Write a protein that binds this ligand. Structure first.
Ligand SMILES: Cc1ncc(COP(=O)(O)O)c(CN)c1O
Ligand SMILES: Cc1ncc(COP(=O)(O)O)c(CN)c1O
Ligand SMILES: Cc1ncc(COP(=O)(O)O)c(CN)c1O
Ligand SMILES: Cc1ncc(COP(=O)(O)O)c(CN)c1O
Lengths: 382, 382, 382, 382
């Protein structure tokens, strides 16, 4: 019966996986072209953008989408990374491989960089590109990206947001907020199979691709994928390199279900489920990793353990039918709950119940019983 | 009932697709680790290599596997590409993005570069790396890789072979032939879902990764994927970047079926089917694109059309229940047959039958009836 | 790659089987009710009947549908069975269990009972019920049911036709021809999973169910299933006994595909494929079991073997990737080809090719080569 | 994400459904014969019986298996039915169609017939057959079958038990308890797809089939299915009437999983889950339909509603992601929980949570919060 409440893949709807069972479909096939076109439109929809913004779906995942941003860069370009933890630091790790200049702002552990501190930095020095993380998966911290952008937009040429753990769950307004690259992956809050990175580009980013050279490699140069994406939307097949055909069939079904629910409702569901889970944790007397309550993400929650060993908690919860994620930040001793994608009020009950039973057996100080009760309470106020 | 006799994906066995229907599996899951370990061993098996050779399975496909070879290179390295057509030329297109020096040898259209000509060139200039294409998909031409390598091995540091349209269908002996990188994709003669590049590295290539810097980017630096692969074989999960989890489940099932059939039998099946198809084409009085009979690949055959329009043949054959591939070489007017993966003697009958009926309707001069008869004859001598 | 060219199940379309993958559907579920209603309408469509005719879908298959006809009978009722072989004789075997009087007409082996001979019998004696077989699966013989009925309609109270191997492949006009019960199964020319019998009742048969007692048992009394069928069409769930829920989901998808193709086209496809196969057999110099050419059914062909052992032919063809059916009539030494459901021109080529190769190996006198050629010829005249 | 906590089908494991995706399997196919043989052995295993007891798997379900017991009867035979409700009464409804004499014992509503009362009746009159219901699905009442049989065995010729809602969940010892027919269906505690009745016959029942005539019809005469079952176990195909081939593939996979878990563990799991659910109901202050605690079945629990309308509860719970079953007994106002098959401790938490939230909204007097707490408590004492 095992539940996957991990950081992605999470539990995938059966209808989504089943869409990948076509034994005679390839990259030129009519069924593929249609699924690709449909998914490109789905991307515009979940990110809040009109047809002026160009969607791309490329092989790999969040990390390949991130590296592909080098398609917009030239040697010696100046980049500012606003990093709240592991995945903010990945921008720096990627850019270390390229002839570019990188400055990184970091907050105290588990905190977030204030919009004021980013504003101050973009006024001090001239940046070609600013990189933000919408939800930092290592700590469960959501950056106030709208607030940051409103402040910095006029000082910088390009703004990119890693929405890998946010798109499909948190409010995203790529066009309204004037983001140049908003990216995500297939296996998180979109709730589909892994193997794709997804990007939405502003007209300004698109102009760079159409008119300038870049420092990109071959596979991850977005100029190489553009003909494939443009073609698909005009109902034509084009070939750059073979895409994950069947993973894209599954993505199109995920997007069908997302449009059926509606993005607003889907955001509200994530807010409810996450608040319900956080109520349960607090009632138990457990501390959340994220330092600032306004930054509690609706996809990931870090749970601090004062006594028990996170490793044993994880081994134990799998035994009781839920796979959670390990905590990977040197400043904290914790584990993570992934609550995203197709997550329901019932998943919130199971999560807090499995946490209660596992911690009681391992001798972590908690208020047994209080957790599920607090969850039920929040779910009732729906 | 439509047949996919394309260049990859081709028709995928139902058992293979079904293996991807596990809705609660992620990159740390025990089921994933096991499928990854199993597939890594399968790779050693289909490429003819002992445990001293290191397998890697990365996201994307043949093009990402090819680009990842930059992990073995330094600025100003000298590379020789032996190119028989489109996919040989892709090596040059990739290496144009990197600070390296590239020389390319090309034969007459539809021919292949003789081992003597490669020998001569590696004696004239000192090369860090030589790139070969086992089967050139654009023309259906198989390079005598063993013969080339026996001649050049002592003159060059590193030898890589693009086995994208050969591995799982043609004889491959990576260790015996002393190849440093043998690569392929998931969606060709392996007969699985698209989304993966596969590589097998010699101890010498492995030593470079373990001890030297390179010109690689981030996502395609093989050093970043090595911990994941090493870990999986020791039954441990490790994370670099999310792999196409469910595509890997499918690959492990493909490898289970391959081991059941046996690699030698599988090679024999491809040889039979391809010879049977070529007999049918010849009986019809159709010319094959590949110039030299010793190079007729057992995965792809280019079919020259003297009168009818290839585009119309393709539209027509889909109507009669087979999707073939377009011919993409400026020197020829043709279409391509993909005969690889799970292909059977019965697929050979259908292919030549659908070709007969389609060409008859479009007015291409052929000997009606003779095709299927010649196919049946070859199949009967099994 | 094995082909199932048997008498039912035959090869099932993937889309049909996949429709059965819903892990949370039961007999009251909205998805089930909808599939049941849809299939009941599909039944009216493939049998040529308006809304005045009542469809029923019951558990089991052709034999349970046949036995359920006892729902229309009283003790001492007089029945005439027109039997062309094994499945005509099944009517008598069923009715032997009931307090009824049965007379059977039979022709010479492999022949059919002429409409004149049935007319003569219904004039001599008064019958409550006449039972016909549309296609007799043991011999491949199609009875001219329209001609029989036109002659006998005025002399008899009730006419039932076993369309198990005819519905979905041969012309069926239940209302126009004034049939009282036309029945079939799910696993034949409808091309779906086994586990259901299907019946279409005239207003006169329906009046019997609504107003009279019968000799029926419990499970197979159609009066017990009527509330379930009527309910489903009015969008309501009702319970008699648990039906094969998921088999019914698959049937609804089969009917979706049938309506997409159109019944007329589907009949034409079966006629083409069967004629193509018969041309191949004749060109080979093989004799067909059915004695009279006007009775050659378009779903089944019996193939006489003069020398080889049918058992060995069957073992051999499975080896070459096609499962045919055994010949089970004491008067003949033969095997059977099932060509029904999703059968295509390509299946006809494979069938005759596999027959040629298998017979050549076993030393049955045939004209090698001529078979496939004659098939191709008929397919070309499409 | 909807849960099916109904009376059968319940939620089916994905592995089980997937086993039915084989598009080229029929009744003579080697894959079918193997699945049938395997399932017949599985039946002996879950019912506690050696090879002397004969398993049969027939089309339809529990009602067809029940009617097939007429295969053991002769005109004027005397039958005693011990009926605890709806499905006990079905025995009488079936036997009303046959030339037999039926006496029925019934207890007060929601109670059960004591072994003493059955003993008294079998001493007063001589009975050919006694029919028992192991779990009466309408009320959730388990009959102490072992105790009844120990008392009556010497006074009656044949004993049959309807184990439709018990086999795979409750202890069953058919051989040790000397039962002549123990029957069930595919879609209940076995957790597979609907479409099959399953029966296990004693040597004495088998002797009747082999040596005597009966009052059975045709399709449900077990003598007609015996050659099919005997054949399959000796690895040979035989044909009586087409079985639900793909449903049988699924059943064999269900039995594979059952053997993996072990029958004793599976019984313990059902006991735990059911006790946990009953604790939750009691903590809420809800009354259970079953009158006598020793008879609380571990597959079904009737829940009495004092204020709210059962119909609205059912409509509401579907909305909150669980489908339960309606209450169908004139003496009570209630709904039913099905907790059987693949049911887990986590399903118990969800069930009582969904019940709490739904009842709170409809104004049924309950102790909010107390339910889940009591469930968690029982699960923790595992
Ligand atoms: C915020 C964030 N950004 C980037 C990534 C990298 O994504 P991927 O593993 O798909 O390459 C992740 C990893 N889940 C992530 O959570
Ligand atoms: C010989 C050859 N090499 C490289 C490639 C590129 O592979 P991919 O499309 O999977 O990136 C192909 C494409 N079929 C190929 O056939
Ligand atoms: C003509 C005919 N009638 C009746 C039947 C009985 O159908 P079933 O096996 O589904 O009970 C068959 C068997 N395929 C048949 O071919
Ligand atoms: C105890 C009992 N016996 C008999 C039956 C009848 O079974 P079916 O609906 O499969 O015919 C049922 C129905 N669930 C049952 O629960």
């Amino acid at each position: 019966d095992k539940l996957l409440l991990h950081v992605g893949p999470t539990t995938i709807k059966e209808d989504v996986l089943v869409a990948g069972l076509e034994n005679n479909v390839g990259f030129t096939s009519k069924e593929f072209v249609e699924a690709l076109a449909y998914s490109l439109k789905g991307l515009r929809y979940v990110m809040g953008a009109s047809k002026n913004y160009q969607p791309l779906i490329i092989p790999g995942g969040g990390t390949s989408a991130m590296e592909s941003v080098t398609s917009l860069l030239k040697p010696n370009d100046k980049i500012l990374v606003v990093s709240n933890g592991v995945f903010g630091d990945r921008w720096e790790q990627i850019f270390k491989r390229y002839p570019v200049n990188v400055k990184v702002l970091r907050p105290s552990p588990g905190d977030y960089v204030k919009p004021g501190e980013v504003e101050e930095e973009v006024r001090k020095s001239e940046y070609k590109l600013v990189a933000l993380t919408h939800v930092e998966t290592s700590t469960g911290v959501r950056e106030p990206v709208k607030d940051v952008i409103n402040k910095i937009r006029k000082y910088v040429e390009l703004i990119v947001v890693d929405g890998v753990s946010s798109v499909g769950a948190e409010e995203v307004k790529a066009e309204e907020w004037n983001v140049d690259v908003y990216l995500t992956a297939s296996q998180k809050a979109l709730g589909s199979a892994a193997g794709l990175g997804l990007l939405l580009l502003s007209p300004k980013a698109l102009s760079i691709l159409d008119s300038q050279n870049s420092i990109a490699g071959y596979y991850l140069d977005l100029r190489n994928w553009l003909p494939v994406m443009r073609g698909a939307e005009e109902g034509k097949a084009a070939y750059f390199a073979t895409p994950p055909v069947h993973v894209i069939l599954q993505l199109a079904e995920a997007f069908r279900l997302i449009e059926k629910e509606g993005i607003e409702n889907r955001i509200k569901r994530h807010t409810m489920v996450a608040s319900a889970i956080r109520a349960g944790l607090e009632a138990l007397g457990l501390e959340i990793v994220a330092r600032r309550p306004e930054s509690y993400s609706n996809t990931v929650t870090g749970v601090i353990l004062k006594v028990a060993d996170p490793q044993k908690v994880l081994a134990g919860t799998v035994n009781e039918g839920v796979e959670f994620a390990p905590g990977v930040h040197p400043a904290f001793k914790y584990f993570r709950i992934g609550h995203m994608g197709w997550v329901t009020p019932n998943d919130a009950i199971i999560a807090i119940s499995v946490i209660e039973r596992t911690l009681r057996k391992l001798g972590e100080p908690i208020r047994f019983g209080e957790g599920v009760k607090a969850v039920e309470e929040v779910l009732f106020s729906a």
